[PDB]
Design an enzyme around this catalytic site. Structure first.
Site, PDB file in Angstrom:
ATOM      1  N   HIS A  41       0.811  -1.219   0.000  1.00  0.00           N
ATOM      2  CA  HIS A  41       0.000   0.000   0.000  1.00  0.00           C
ATOM      3  C   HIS A  41       0.844   1.268   0.000  1.00  0.00           C
ATOM      4  CE1 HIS A  41       0.134  -0.411   4.600  1.00  0.00           C
ATOM      5  NE2 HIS A  41       0.585   0.815   4.399  1.00  0.00           N
ATOM      6  N   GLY A 143       2.777   5.919  10.243  1.00  0.00           N
ATOM      7  CA  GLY A 143       4.149   5.734   9.837  1.00  0.00           C
ATOM      8  C   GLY A 143       4.844   4.512  10.407  1.00  0.00           C
ATOM      9  N   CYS A 145       4.080   1.493   9.685  1.00  0.00           N
ATOM     10  CA  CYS A 145       3.905   0.395   8.741  1.00  0.00           C
ATOM     11  C   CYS A 145       5.248  -0.068   8.205  1.00  0.00           C
ATOM     12  CB  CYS A 145       3.010   0.820   7.576  1.00  0.00           C
ATOM     13  SG  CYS A 145       1.290   0.807   8.058  1.00  0.00           S
TER      14      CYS A 145
HETATM   15  C1  LIG Z   1       1.134   2.559   8.441  1.00  0.00           C
HETATM   16  O1  LIG Z   1       2.086   3.538   8.854  1.00  0.00           O
HETATM   17  C2  LIG Z   1      -0.259   2.891   8.963  1.00  0.00           C
HETATM   18  C3  LIG Z   1      -0.239   2.587  10.458  1.00  0.00           C
HETATM   19  C4  LIG Z   1      -1.606   2.604  11.106  1.00  0.00           C
HETATM   20  C5  LIG Z   1      -2.045   4.033  11.383  1.00  0.00           C
HETATM   21  C6  LIG Z   1      -2.335   4.079  12.880  1.00  0.00           C
HETATM   22  N1  LIG Z   1      -1.723   2.877  13.417  1.00  0.00           N
HETATM   23  C7  LIG Z   1      -1.494   1.980  12.475  1.00  0.00           C
HETATM   24  O2  LIG Z   1      -1.255   0.791  12.658  1.00  0.00           O
HETATM   25  N2  LIG Z   1      -1.233   2.095   8.236  1.00  0.00           N
HETATM   26  C8  LIG Z   1      -2.393   2.644   7.887  1.00  0.00           C
HETATM   27  O3  LIG Z   1      -2.667   3.782   8.261  1.00  0.00           O
HETATM   28  C9  LIG Z   1      -3.341   1.815   7.053  1.00  0.00           C
HETATM   29  C10 LIG Z   1      -3.219   2.209   5.576  1.00  0.00           C
HETATM   30  C11 LIG Z   1      -3.357   1.091   4.536  1.00  0.00           C
HETATM   31  C12 LIG Z   1      -4.043   1.707   3.312  1.00  0.00           C
HETATM   32  C13 LIG Z   1      -4.400   0.692   2.219  1.00  0.00           C
HETATM   33  C14 LIG Z   1      -5.244  -0.445   2.778  1.00  0.00           C
HETATM   34  C15 LIG Z   1      -4.483  -1.114   3.922  1.00  0.00           C
HETATM   35  C16 LIG Z   1      -4.151  -0.116   5.042  1.00  0.00           C
HETATM   36  N3  LIG Z   1      -4.717   2.049   7.457  1.00  0.00           N
HETATM   37  C17 LIG Z   1      -5.104   1.811   8.706  1.00  0.00           C
HETATM   38  O4  LIG Z   1      -4.385   1.268   9.551  1.00  0.00           O
HETATM   39  C18 LIG Z   1      -6.482   2.277   9.048  1.00  0.00           C
HETATM   40  N4  LIG Z   1      -7.363   1.160   9.303  1.00  0.00           N
HETATM   41  C19 LIG Z   1      -8.425   0.906   8.555  1.00  0.00           C
HETATM   42  O5  LIG Z   1      -9.486   1.522   8.657  1.00  0.00           O
HETATM   43  O6  LIG Z   1      -8.294  -0.146   7.559  1.00  0.00           O
HETATM   44  C20 LIG Z   1      -9.420  -0.943   7.163  1.00  0.00           C
HETATM   45  C21 LIG Z   1      -9.694  -2.025   8.218  1.00  0.00           C
HETATM   46  F1  LIG Z   1      -9.864  -3.210   7.641  1.00  0.00           F
HETATM   47  F2  LIG Z   1     -10.781  -1.644   8.895  1.00  0.00           F
HETATM   48  F3  LIG Z   1      -8.653  -2.178   9.031  1.00  0.00           F
HETATM   49  C22 LIG Z   1      -6.327   3.129  10.309  1.00  0.00           C
HETATM   50  C23 LIG Z   1      -5.453   4.365  10.019  1.00  0.00           C
HETATM   51  O7  LIG Z   1      -7.625   3.236  10.948  1.00  0.00           O
HETATM   52  C24 LIG Z   1      -8.256   4.428  11.409  1.00  0.00           C
HETATM   53  C25 LIG Z   1      -9.480   3.936  12.162  1.00  0.00           C
HETATM   54  C26 LIG Z   1      -8.662   5.274  10.199  1.00  0.00           C
HETATM   55  C27 LIG Z   1      -7.454   5.209  12.448  1.00  0.00           C
END
Ligand code: A1ARK
Ligand code: A1ARK
Lengths: 306, 306
Positions: A41, A143, A145
């Site tokens: 991603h 960040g 990830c």
């Molecule tokens: C990587 O740096 C980052 C770390 C996250 C952010 C906060 N703690 C973490 O572990 N990863 C992401 O932000 C990640 C992005 C990525 C985008 C493409 C699809 C796969 C994920 N997104 C998330 O971790 C969000 N979760 C989410 O809603 O994903 C869908 C599912 F299935 F529900 F998990 C985070 C940022 O969730 C929120 C609630 C928006 C804070």
């Protein structure tokens, strides 16, 4: 004596962390030999996240789109490929600090250390377990990830986790290093939920054996119980069934303490039934479940790593 | 999100660990520049321990009595001196992996990471606090002496602890790196006991602020309390007094959560008075006291180290 939630020394993994930047996305990668592994991603943007087609997204990128920062040294990407949910960016520099290493996909209940990283720079190290529902209760901010989880065996780093995402309940999901998610999770921003977690019974038992090695004895009793009768009491309290294979793993801890595994199960039964009544075990007021039998033996006996 | 008892990355300290052997005693030393620091009881034997005179014992040794193993490489001792309770063995090889580093004597309530080591080989890393009674609740077996505790600040390792001994209650005592014991302990096998420990109140408050940053809110209330009225309830439950200086340190955590420090104290009061009633805070059923305000800010905001 004493018993601590203990991570492996992290210096071998610290030497592999790099910063990977692409567009407006910056995360950590793992640099082993001439290859940088990171979550795929990283090629998404702010409007690529709702339902992406990473093949389409990736044929559109060139190597010079990937900025790979290793300290104050830019690495040059010379090729890229996607395996499942991870990019492998081929770079011109082999990492001289490459440890001996393997990739392993761990079973739930197993533990590992997570070196938490931001901008390719290690921030902290802690211990984790794969929860029966294939989440991990991590500590991750934005960040983080591409941070990895790992065990060390003698001189070899078994990489087992790479971080991708936080679920709405605040637990974390991720892949093995070959890019396969643990559990049913995809890397696509959608409605997704963990699934009902359960307690890793074999680990609770190993921790009670830790307590006994370390002088806590108050929770024992004279009663025994059959394996079937234990699992009837287990499933009420949302514990996992104990298999005969779990019993055998717990052999050495039974043998060193003189407490038959089935007798420790009779202890856990009454603990679940009667609570702990204001007492603590190894300084804890809850039945802890993120020590495996490996761990207890490692920490209560003294195994190191060169 | 999430909150974990998080150690600093340990790679900089791993590169300094060595094995020091003298007679029948083998322990770990710390190799910085051309000097190996280790506990001075390494010069004791099995009948030197009851009440030794280390000056007399040390004038009797020559440099070639000290075997200093660094990996599969013998270092040569070219001189030795004792400062307080630690030997400094001067060696012909400067450690090329010497980080930037300081020695600091920490106050009680402060935390640090311990890289546990045996035979000069790092085994595990965990987080600790100096307890108000100058012990640390460590995880140490035999041969773990000379293992160090440390904080990392940006790129600099502040060494603050070196391990010497387990007390009969199973907690651990040790020196700063300039060899001064924390607390009233001597390095002589005698009757010695810890002294009544207390709970690090300022740390419990910082951890409750961690919870609030991470979504746990159930323990808050509308009540406030004066600082004097809080310390009256504190001293009953064996908590340390909160000083005005403790309040000010907790400023940013007050400001980021919008909970005045005195209001969080009213929360802790009712928590101590009414228990937690089967609820948990940050996955804990006890009020945790080994996060400082530093730590909470570090882990809830994302500070790294290069
Ligand atoms: C990587 O740096 C980052 C770390 C996250 C952010 C906060 N703690 C973490 O572990 N990863 C992401 O932000 C990640 C992005 C990525 C985008 C493409 C699809 C796969 C994920 N997104 C998330 O971790 C969000 N979760 C989410 O809603 O994903 C869908 C599912 F299935 F529900 F998990 C985070 C940022 O969730 C929120 C609630 C928006 C804070
Ligand atoms: C260093 O490798 C070793 C580590 C100890 C052993 C078990 N866990 C540890 O932390 N240190 C010692 O064994 C240390 C030896 C040293 C000899 C000269 C005087 C200073 C200590 N001794 C102890 O840690 C013993 N504690 C003790 O009785 O010391 C006196 C006092 F003040 F009570 F602490 C340990 C081994 O204690 C017993 C109860 C014998 C297990």
């Amino acid at each position: 004596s004493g018993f601590r939630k203990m991570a492996f020394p992290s210096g071998k993994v610290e030497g592999c962390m790099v910063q990977v930047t692409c567009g407006t996305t910056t995360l950590n990668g793992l640099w082993l030999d001439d290859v940088v592994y990171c979550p795929r991603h990283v090629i998404c943007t702010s409007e690529d996240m709702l339902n992406p087609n990473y093949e389409d997204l990736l044929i559109r990128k060139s190597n010079h789109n990937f900025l790979v920062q290793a300290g104050n040294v830019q690495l040059r990407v010379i090729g890229h490929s996607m395996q499942n949910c991870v990019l492998k960016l081929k770079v011109d520099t082999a990492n001289p600090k490459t440890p001996k290493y393997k990739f392993v996909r761990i079973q739930p209940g197993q533990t590992f250390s997570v070196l938490a990283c931001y901008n390719g720079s290690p921030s902290g190290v802690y211990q984790c377990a794969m929860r029966p529902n294939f989440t991990i209760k991590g500590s991750f901010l934005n960040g983080s990830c591409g941070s990895v989880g790992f065990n060390i065996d003698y001189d070899c780093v078994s990489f087992c986790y790479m971080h991708h995402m936080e679920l709405p309940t605040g637990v974390h999901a991720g892949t093995d290093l070959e890019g396969n998610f643990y559990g049913p999770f995809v890397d696509r921003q959608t409605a997704q939920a963990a699934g009902t977690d359960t307690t890793i019974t074999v680990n609770v038992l190993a921790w009670l054996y830790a307590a006994v090695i370390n002088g806590d004895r108050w929770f024992l009793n004279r009663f025994t119980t059959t394996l079937n009768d234990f699992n009837l009491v287990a499933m009420k309290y949302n514990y996992e069934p104990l298999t005969q294979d779990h019993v055998d793993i717990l052999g050495p801890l039974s043998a060193q303490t003189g407490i038959a595994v089935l007798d420790m199960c009779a202890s856990l039964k009454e603990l679940l039934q009667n609570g702990m009544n204001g007492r603590t075990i190894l300084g804890s007021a809850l039945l802890e479940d993120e020590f495996t039998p490996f761990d207890v033996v490692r920490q209560c006996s003294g195994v190191t790593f060169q």
